[PDB]
Amino acid sequence: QVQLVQSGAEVKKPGASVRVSCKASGFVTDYFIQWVRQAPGQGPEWMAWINPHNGETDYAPKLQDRVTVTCDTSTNTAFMELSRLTSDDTALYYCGRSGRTDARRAPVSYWGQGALVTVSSASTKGPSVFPLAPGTAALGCLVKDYFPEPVTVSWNSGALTSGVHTFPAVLQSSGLYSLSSVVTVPSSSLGTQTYICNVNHKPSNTKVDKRVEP
């Protein structure tokens, strides 16, 4: 059925270029393809449209000069290139399908999953996982100094879900991220139940299991 499959997450230094792909399956010269980006904690921002049936494009004037959209008929894939990147460009880059290229104008009805582009002078780097040591008791893991997003945290390999809060990451002034994950448990449970946080940083192929003791 209808799918927009985007290329994987990328890290770029300031001044570099990125090209995001948007591979159509289930339908790409039949429909307008659109590009929308979303910075973490911000709203969506429209970038561009292409008519893949004749190569016509429209670009946001702010971010015209730096942006190019193209489409390859043969591989059924559309591309957005953004040049002269700064940390202002760190965003989830969505492609989307709007109306048919022969139809009335329409908004974006089908969205890709987005490609996270992180623009930074930091290098890819797995976290340090530190315990947050403990009748309800709070305990946790501090997942510090990793780059880029994201990291996933589970407890007791996903056995423990009730009372868990995994917080949004903060971007430290070092350019590295830090995140906490906490859980509230019965105080009587301590020194009977073992608590291990399971941290996965896919981007650095890092898995840490950290036991939290009283």
Place this chain on the structure above:
Amino acid sequence: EIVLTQSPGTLSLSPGARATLSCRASQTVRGNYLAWFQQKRGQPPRLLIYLASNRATGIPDRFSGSGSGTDFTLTISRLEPEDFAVYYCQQYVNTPETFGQGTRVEIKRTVAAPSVFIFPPSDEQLKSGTASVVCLLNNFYPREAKVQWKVDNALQSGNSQESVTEQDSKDSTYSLSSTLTLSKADYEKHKVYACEVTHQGLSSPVTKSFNRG
């Protein structure tokens, strides 16, 4: 650029209530090419309304777009718990095809004070020469809260970061984590580490403390 101004920024309502969301354009949106999107969690936007008043395919009839010119409204006639989300308007006729800044619709519940917990740095972290001290504010409402770090009763400033969870789907509360980061050198200079929490559910700000040792 057509600028879209949505209001309010935040709407706190009971499930079952009517919600009215406004989108004002800085100029006429020709053809009424005004769309409404819903966004939840970490998902792409979902189209609700096109041409200002037309429900997209498989969108329930409790959603209603109206207006024309510079003045548009999304009404949700009866809020189901899945409708608490961010709503963006967008004009899709004039380049650039601008979005509004979003209205957040959040569940209105009774006031709940945070439960506050403070975590000293681990010995594992101190071995590497930095001290992260963490303050947890657990399961509070409303979202508005203030953390003040103190070190021997001196107010801190510029050396902490915090983040807030999404509204909990079971109890409609928020939680907040604040981290104070110091060098092991600066940490070892002081005894009393405290986070002071201000919240509508607290009669006065509450402080949670430990002594290094």
